[PDB]
Amino acid sequence: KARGGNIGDGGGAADRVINQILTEMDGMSTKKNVFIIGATNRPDIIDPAILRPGRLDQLIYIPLPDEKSRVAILKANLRKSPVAKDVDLEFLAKMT
Amino acid sequence: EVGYDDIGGCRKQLAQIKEMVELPLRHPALFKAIGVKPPRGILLYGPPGTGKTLIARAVANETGAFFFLINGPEIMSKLAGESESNLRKAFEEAEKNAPAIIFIDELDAIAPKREKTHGEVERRIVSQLLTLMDGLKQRAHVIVMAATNRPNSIDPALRRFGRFDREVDIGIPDATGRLEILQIHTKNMKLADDVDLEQVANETHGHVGADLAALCSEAALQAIRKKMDLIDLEDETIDAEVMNSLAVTMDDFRWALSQSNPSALRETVVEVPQVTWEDIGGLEDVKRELQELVQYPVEHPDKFLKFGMTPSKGVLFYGPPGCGKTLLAKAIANECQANFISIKGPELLTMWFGESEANVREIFDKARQAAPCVLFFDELDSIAKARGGNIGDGGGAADRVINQILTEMDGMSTKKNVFIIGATNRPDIIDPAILRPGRLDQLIYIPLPDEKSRVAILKANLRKSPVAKDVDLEFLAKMTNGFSGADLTEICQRACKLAIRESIESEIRRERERQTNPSAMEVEEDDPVPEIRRDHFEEAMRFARRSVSDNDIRKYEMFAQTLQQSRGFGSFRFPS
Amino acid sequence: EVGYDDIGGCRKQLAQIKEMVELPLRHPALFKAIGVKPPRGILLYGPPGTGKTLIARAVANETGAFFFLINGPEIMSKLAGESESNLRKAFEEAEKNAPAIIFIDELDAIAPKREKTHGEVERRIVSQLLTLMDGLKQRAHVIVMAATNRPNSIDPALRRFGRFDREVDIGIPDATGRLEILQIHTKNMKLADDVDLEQVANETHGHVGADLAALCSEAALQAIRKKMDLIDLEDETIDAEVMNSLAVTMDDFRWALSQSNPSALRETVVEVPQVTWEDIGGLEDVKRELQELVQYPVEHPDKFLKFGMTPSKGVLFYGPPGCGKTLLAKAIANECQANFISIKGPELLTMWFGESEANVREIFDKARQAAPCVLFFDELDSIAKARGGNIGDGGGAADRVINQILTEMDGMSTKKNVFIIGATNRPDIIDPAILRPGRLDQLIYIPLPDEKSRVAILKANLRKSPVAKDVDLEFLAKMTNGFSGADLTEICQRACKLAIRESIESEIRRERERQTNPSAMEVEEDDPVPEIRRDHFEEAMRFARRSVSDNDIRKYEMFAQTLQQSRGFGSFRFPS
Numbered sequence A: 001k002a003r004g005g006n007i008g009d010g011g012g013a014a015d016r017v018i019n020q021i022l023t024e025m026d027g028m029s030t031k032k033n034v035f036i037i038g039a040t041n042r043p044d045i046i047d048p049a050i051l052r053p054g055r056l057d058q059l060i061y062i063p064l065p066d067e068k069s070r071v072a073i074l075k076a077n078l079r080k081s082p083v084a085k086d087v088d089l090e091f092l093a094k095m096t
Numbered sequence B, C: 001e002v003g004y005d006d007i008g009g010c011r012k013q014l015a016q017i018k019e020m021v022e023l024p025l026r027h028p029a030l031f032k033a034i035g036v037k038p039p040r041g042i043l044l045y046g047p048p049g050t051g052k053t054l055i056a057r058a059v060a061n062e063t064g065a066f067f068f069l070i071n072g073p074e075i076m077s078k079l080a081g082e083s084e085s086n087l088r089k090a091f092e093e094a095e096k097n098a099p100a101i102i103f104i105d106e107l108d109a110i111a112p113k114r115e116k117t118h119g120e121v122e123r124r125i126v127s128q129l130l131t132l133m134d135g136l137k138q139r140a141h142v143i144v145m146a147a148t149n150r151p152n153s154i155d156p157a158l159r160r161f162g163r164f165d166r167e168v169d170i171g172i173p174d175a176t177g178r179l180e181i182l183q184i185h186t187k188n189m190k191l192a193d194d195v196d197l198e199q200v201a202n203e204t205h206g207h208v209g210a211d212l213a214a215l216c217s218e219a220a221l222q223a224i225r226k227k228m229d230l231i232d233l234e235d236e237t238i239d240a241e242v243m244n245s246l247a248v249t250m251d252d253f254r255w256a257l258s259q260s261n262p263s264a265l266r267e268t269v270v271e272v273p274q275v276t277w278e279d280i281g282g283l284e285d286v287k288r289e290l291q292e293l294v295q296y297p298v299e300h301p302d303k304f305l306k307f308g309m310t311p312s313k314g315v316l317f318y319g320p321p322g323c324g325k326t327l328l329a330k331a332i333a334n335e336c337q338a339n340f341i342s343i344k345g346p347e348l349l350t351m352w353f354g355e356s357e358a359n360v361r362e363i364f365d366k367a368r369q370a371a372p373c374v375l376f377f378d379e380l381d382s383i384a385k386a387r388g389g390n391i392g393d394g395g396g397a398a399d400r401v402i403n404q405i406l407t408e409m410d411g412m413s414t415k416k417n418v419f420i421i422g423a424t425n426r427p428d429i430i431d432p433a434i435l436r437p438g439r440l441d442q443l444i445y446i447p448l449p450d451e452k453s454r455v456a457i458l459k460a461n462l463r464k465s466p467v468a469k470d471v472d473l474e475f476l477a478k479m480t481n482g483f484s485g486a487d488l489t490e491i492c493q494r495a496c497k498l499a500i501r502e503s504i505e506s507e508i509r510r511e512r513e514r515q516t517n518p519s520a521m522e523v524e525e526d527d528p529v530p531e532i533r534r535d536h537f538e539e540a541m542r543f544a545r546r547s548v549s550d551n552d553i554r555k556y557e558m559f560a561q562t563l564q565q566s567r568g569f570g571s572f573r574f575p576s
């Protein structure tokens, strides 16, 4: 994103930091314990080399929370705060 | 001797040092029966000439501890191999007179090594000093206080636990402290009645305690040169009565201020702004929202804790230029009585051009030290404008300085006191990451001042100037349909300029009239224009102009409605 | 011995040093009965050969203080471990003869460490010198004056409070001071009647006192070589009468000036401009506005203070090239009798290309020291032009040099004396931040000279040249419908060139005539063309040209009306 995304730089998707991350991952796996998890809101602009085998190949899509998921999120956010039982949370989650 | 009265500036770190050192020194026997570790070392740092040595001496005198002064270059000037003996003997002597205070003035000379560490013998001196400082067996009550211009100048191992574990930034004295410093430095010269030391104190921005003393001495010397020299009656010792007959006049102080050259004007200022809500005539919704966001967490922290809500620590003001965003930030800081730090756009542009963003880390650390503080990033969109705005660079909105600011903010919130306020006249080009949660998410829009707001702005601008009651201010404010605060200030300044020019020209002619035709009886009619009149304001308003066009206000209205709360929930009702 | 008469240049810092040192030295007993701290150290800095040591010696002689000279390399050339003894003994000896003055010539050798601080023994010397300098127990009246090329060359701890707390920049002598230096250096050579030392002084720009002495010596040696060598009558001691018979002619001085090579031409000049309002024929509205903005705050500061108005300290001249903006700035500086510093565009471009904007800080500090001063930034739009102007760089108008200038201006105004004047031929591309309040907000438009203004410009350009009364100047000025000041200067220069060529060719032919046909009786008819005539001016005007097209004047008119005072308030009346 910093380099662009629609036009960007004249060069390709490769950058210094991602290249170093790829080198470390390629030199990784020896440890058998470190597990790399990557989160990105712009999958289109992510470097394709990141998704090659031996890298973050398992792509997982996180969709918008469902009604039940929304209810759980509201409960988690409001667990600490004193919430009156009168306010129905399922209705609010479904409304959103 | 020297005491708290001598220590001027009322900068409120002397109180912190007192709270630090009384019990270790004022009640030394108490720590013998209680298991607690007192402050083994205190690092006083700040601009030179701020009285750090004076503060240490005053604390030593007021607490009865045996004060020992280890001058930096005094030991450094000694021959290699025997300076170490001097340092060791100094610590032993201070140990003997328990409790004792060992003050190391100019610590950045004994242990200047910042891991560069040039030379050989200086490495020995730093290591031996480290051994001594860490060698305090917690017996007796020797407290080692050191002076340094900046914390990072001394060796980092000196900053570690047990050597110097707590630091106090004395900093430049403020207007209130500058006035108190002037009072302390002007107490035996028999100051004149006309001179008040208040106007000089306000005009004395940028001076330090040493600078204030030098200015007072220069004014005294000007007084001595102006008078008592013409008579030329001098002896071995000037007569006390003859010297007392002179009074330091305001003119002498004014000349001295003109000849001051303060020794660190550039140094950043950490000061409680004097601006008040009165200066801003309105923004009641904005005023209440700012009061909420800033004041409520501190005034009523318990109620924030009860609901398990963490108050936002960032607010971004957006609006047309000249509407009072900087003034609003100063007012909000003043209401909470918290220190205010302002980072204008030139500083950010300098950090960006120079590729030196580590200054952001230093700025945030300074804001953290001066808590409670309101860290204001004025005109934060300057870097985006510098890179473009319509097309700009090929890359995105991310830049080095904003990225460093985001990193510091993400690593912030720990302090619980620093509050970040951002002002930007171009919200469209501001980096979106700035507005994410945990950052300056609370966007506040500052609109053009209303009629009542315009009246208040005019009154604030014209409070100092003599304004005749004939000139109606409400009519002028209402007449200005869309003038910004800057436009109103320009109108007031132009009216004052017209009045000043007319007064100067008139009294100049009147003086010709007395030179050309010497009148037999001298009878001055006073000033031909003693206050600003209706005609001056009419001529000034003739040149009134609207700096802010309606198209840029339209863009701001667009962004405001670009933060639109949806259009389907306005009638949300729970099922009952 | 040496005194104020020997000290030449009339540079007006000797007076400041006198005011500094009389009472501490001229009236030492006075400070015994009065509690005041005198100047413990004074740092004289400037280009080498400016007479700093001479000034110190003259002050010591004229005040009776025992002068002690501690040569930099004299102590530095001594063996390590015993040079410290030399410095300590020098201070003790100066202490014995109280009052005494200790002069440290070439201080940048004893303590050159700028925090780089190479070596080991030199660190000892700097630290011990620091201990001695700070070790002055305020007893006796020893004043330590030091000489250094630049303030930043010496160790910063030497610049701190109590070591060297006040600095004086002797600087390069000016035309008036160059003339006085020539007079002092030409007093025993029996200067000839034809030589006046005024033309040489004007042509002597760039020389220092040492340079002036060297030029005078070279002229004397040329005189000795030209005569008294042909006779070759020499003995053990040349006869006084024989040597007195020679007179240094203007030709010898001219040759010496040709063979001068001044030792610091590049050094920036801080000089009161000799230009006067007479050189500019008009701009009465502009002249009065400039008089207001600059002169009024100082001539009548009391009236500015009465109305609570702070006068603007920045003015931006905009207009077509060659209209006299630089001359106007020089004239305004001359009227106020304040030092003038000019920063032309090449300097800004050099700072921008080299990525060295810290020079702006140095320039502003120099302007601050030479107060009252008029800091003029000539052709400030050069960087914008260098980056483009129609498309330019992808980024905005902000650049490193302008940002540094803005930072210095924002940190300025404290001095109350420096006044910033900006000239730009491309107001459209100038950064808008430059025009914000607190910056060069007062925009002044310099239009093409009028008919009367053109007449005045022609008279000023032709004042030195011999112009025949036959050639009517008003007609020529009126004839030039839109010629700029530069165009008029070019026309005058071309006319002078034509006259010079005609005179040279004619006298050359006339000399052939005498060589070809030796006349029996020599009777020179004098010069065939003694002054500039109508035909020369007609031929020159034949090549007259309008450098400034009407389209760029149209753009300037657009910007001028782009600062339009609205169109609805012209009839503003208060309700009565």
Ligand SMILES: Cc1cc(OCc2nnc(SC3CCCC3)n2-c2cccnc2)ccc1-c1ccc(S(C)(=O)=O)cc1
Pocket: A032, A033, A034, A035
């Ligand atoms: C047996 C095996 C274990 C392994 O590692 C297991 C492991 N332990 N800790 C961790 S990490 C920790 C767990 C939670 C956070 C991270 N892991 C691990 C490994 C991979 C992915 N996630 C975790 C690798 C590779 C192998 C094998 C597979 C086939 C053959 S053959 C010649 O074809 O017959 C030989 C060897």
Ligand SMILES: Cc1cc(OCc2nnc(SC3CCCC3)n2-c2cccnc2)ccc1-c1ccc(S(C)(=O)=O)cc1
Pocket: A080, A081, B293, B294, B295, B297, B298, B301, B302, B304, B305, B306, B307, B308, B309, B310, B311, B312, B313, B336, B338, B372, B373, B374, B416, B417, B418, B419
């Ligand atoms: C109680 C609390 C106070 C706080 O800090 C208060 C504070 N003091 N000085 C300042 S600063 C100064 C004031 C004027 C200028 C700046 N602040 C402050 C904090 C935030 C925003 N503005 C000011 C933070 C967070 C909490 C909490 C909230 C919920 C829970 S739980 C587990 O859900 O039950 C636990 C802890």
Ligand SMILES: Cc1cc(OCc2nnc(SC3CCCC3)n2-c2cccnc2)ccc1-c1ccc(S(C)(=O)=O)cc1
Pocket: B464, C293, C294, C295, C297, C298, C301, C302, C304, C305, C306, C307, C308, C309, C310, C311, C312, C313, C336, C338, C372, C373, C374, C416, C417, C418, C419
């Ligand atoms: C009285 C005053 C003088 C001043 O400075 C005057 C000055 N002297 N040398 C110079 S410089 C030199 C002159 C020729 C070349 C440059 N100046 C000067 C100042 C501004 C612009 N040009 C010159 C500033 C500000 C003030 C004041 C105004 C209002 C108030 S109140 C609280 O509202 O009642 C308090 C203080």
Ligand SMILES: Nc1ncnc2c1ncn2[C@@H]1O[C@H](COP(=O)(O)OP(=O)(O)O)[C@@H](O)[C@H]1O
Pocket: B006, B007, B008, B009, B047, B048, B049, B050, B051, B052, B053, B054, B055, B105, B147, B181, B184, B185, B208, B209, B210, B213, C161
């Ligand atoms: N607030 C103050 N009250 C009285 N004197 C002050 C004050 N601030 C600075 N000074 C002056 O500063 C002089 C030297 O400064 P100092 O105390 O040594 O600080 P530093 O070591 O940082 O330079 C002192 O002689 C004192 O007169």
Ligand SMILES: Nc1ncnc2c1ncn2[C@@H]1O[C@H](COP(=O)(O)OP(=O)(O)O)[C@@H](O)[C@H]1O
Pocket: C006, C007, C008, C009, C047, C048, C049, C050, C051, C052, C053, C054, C055, C105, C147, C181, C184, C185, C208, C209, C210, C213
């Ligand atoms: N204004 C002056 N009047 C008389 N002599 C001068 C003057 N300026 C410079 N000189 C000459 O400069 C010579 C040496 O320069 P000096 O005084 O030592 O200055 P610096 O130490 O900076 O080089 C002196 O011998 C003196 O003759």
